Amino acid sequence: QHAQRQLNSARHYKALQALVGLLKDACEHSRNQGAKALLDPRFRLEFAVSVIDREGNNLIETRTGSQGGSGGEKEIIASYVLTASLSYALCPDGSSRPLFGTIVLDQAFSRSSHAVAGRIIAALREFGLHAVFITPNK
Amino acid sequence: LCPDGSSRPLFGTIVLDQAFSRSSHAVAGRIIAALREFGLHAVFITPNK
Amino acid sequence: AEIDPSGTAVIGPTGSGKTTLVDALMTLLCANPRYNLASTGGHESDRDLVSYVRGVTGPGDGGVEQSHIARQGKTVTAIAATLERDGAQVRLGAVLW
DNA sequence: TTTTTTTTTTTTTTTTTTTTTTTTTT
DNA sequence: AAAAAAAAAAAAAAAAAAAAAAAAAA
Ligand SMILES: Nc1ncnc2c1ncn2[C@@H]1O[C@H](COP(=O)(O)OP(=O)(O)OP(O)(O)=S)[C@@H](O)[C@H]1O
Numbered sequence: 001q002h003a004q005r006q007l008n009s010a011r012h013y014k015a016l017q018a019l020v021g022l023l024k025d026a027c028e029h030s031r032n033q034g035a036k037a038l039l040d041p042r043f044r045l046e047f048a049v050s051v052i053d054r055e056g057n058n059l060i061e062t063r064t065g066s067q068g069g070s071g072g073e074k075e076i077i078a079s080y081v082l083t084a085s086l087s088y089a090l091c092p093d094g095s096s097r098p099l100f101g102t103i104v105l106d107q108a109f110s111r112s113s114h115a116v117a118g119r120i121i122a123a124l125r126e127f128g129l130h131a132v133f134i135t136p137n138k
Numbered sequence: 139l140c141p142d143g144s145s146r147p148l149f150g151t152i153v154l155d156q157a158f159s160r161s162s163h164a165v166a167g168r169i170i171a172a173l174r175e176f177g178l179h180a181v182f183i184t185p186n187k
Numbered sequence: 188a189e190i191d192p193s194g195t196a197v198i199g200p201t202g203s204g205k206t207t208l209v210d211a212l213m214t215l216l217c218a219n220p221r222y223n224l225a226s227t228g229g230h231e232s233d234r235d236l237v238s239y240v241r242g243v244t245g246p247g248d249g250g251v252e253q254s255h256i257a258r259q260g261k262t263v264t265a266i267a268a269t270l271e272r273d274g275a276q277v278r279l280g281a282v283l284w
Numbered sequence: 285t286t287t288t289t290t291t292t293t294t295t296t297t298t299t300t301t302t303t304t305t306t307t308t309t310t
Numbered sequence: 311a312a313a314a315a316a317a318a319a320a321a322a323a324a325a326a327a328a329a330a331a332a333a334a335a336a
């Protein structure tokens with residue numbers, strides 16, 4: 001932006017040189033952070049998740065990842081977010097009902113307790129899909 | 139725990155976490171037998187399994 | 188907490204504090220701890236000593252009161268462990284404040 | 285006796301290079 | 311049926327930050 005305004009003052013050739021050189025350099029090195037931040041629109045945002053109580057609307061906890069958690073918490077959070085994203089990513093992305101509904105879980109419930117598994121199954125059925133399970137005799 | 143051949147260890151406790159998380163009955167049995175074979179005191183952790 | 192001399196076990200529901208006890212034991216021996224190792228399979232570590240001594244529970248939310256921390260201000264913590272072989276007995280301990 | 289200053293070692297992050305495979309044209 | 315261009319993943323390396331222990335001074 002700075003370069004642009006200087007050009008507006010010049011109306012003399014070095015401003016054009018610098019602007020074109022900056023743009024050309026930005027064209028190269030697409031694998032660096034600056035080029036991603038300048039051209040790709042999706043790199044100009046920051047995302048976060050929040051837990052909100054049912055009644056009312058209150059922030060209870062804000063997270064940027066899955067750090068510092070226990071064993072079961074990481075598994076449940078990851079499964080929940082992944083299945084929600086997958087459900088959106090299918091046909092209901094552009095609305096309508098999914099045309100290809102199925103999801104495969106491997107080593108299901110390798111670290112959680114009974115109640116966590118119950119919540120997982122309840123949420124998975126509520127999302128409205130079909131599941132196939134792969135477990136040892138645990 | 140015994141750099142030389144003198145045997146007679148002084149520290150003999152082992153701790154395991156989330157033991158037997160991705161194995162069946164026979165594997166756990168063999169692990170326990172092998173651990174007991176060397177003559178080591180053991181502690182186990184398990185989320186009710 | 189006591190340990191039988193013939194092999195014991197620890198059980199409990201999820202998110203109870205078992206690994207907290209095991210890490211409180213582990214801190215007393217190794218030169219540089221790797222807290223909460225088994226959770227991620229053996230690749231990374233997550234917690235740190237001051238986090239334990241101040242008892243933070245979860246990342247919480249914004250604000251300034253910082254309700255997600257139990258102890259604020261002056262505090263004292265003590266850890267101790269006991270080994271027995273035959274009559275003779277030894278104790279290892281640490282005091283922080 | 286108490287405090288400050290300095291050094292040392294360990295960890296994380298970002299950049300660049302290298303290789304293999306796939307698809308297209310002659 | 312054989313030769314050339316393109317793309318995605320793996321690996322090594324350089325830069326930066328942080329925390330603990332010893333030496334020195336009021
Ligand atoms: N540094 C920390 N950051 C965030 N939360 C923490 C921290 N330390 C302890 N906690 C909380 O304290 C709880 C105690 O559980 P943990 O001891 O960590 O795991 P656990 O009780 O052993 O359950 P598992 O899955 O069997 S290891 C955790 O689930 C967290 O909610």
Ligand SMILES: [Mg+2]
Nearest residue numbers: 222223233234
């Ligand atoms: Mg932990």
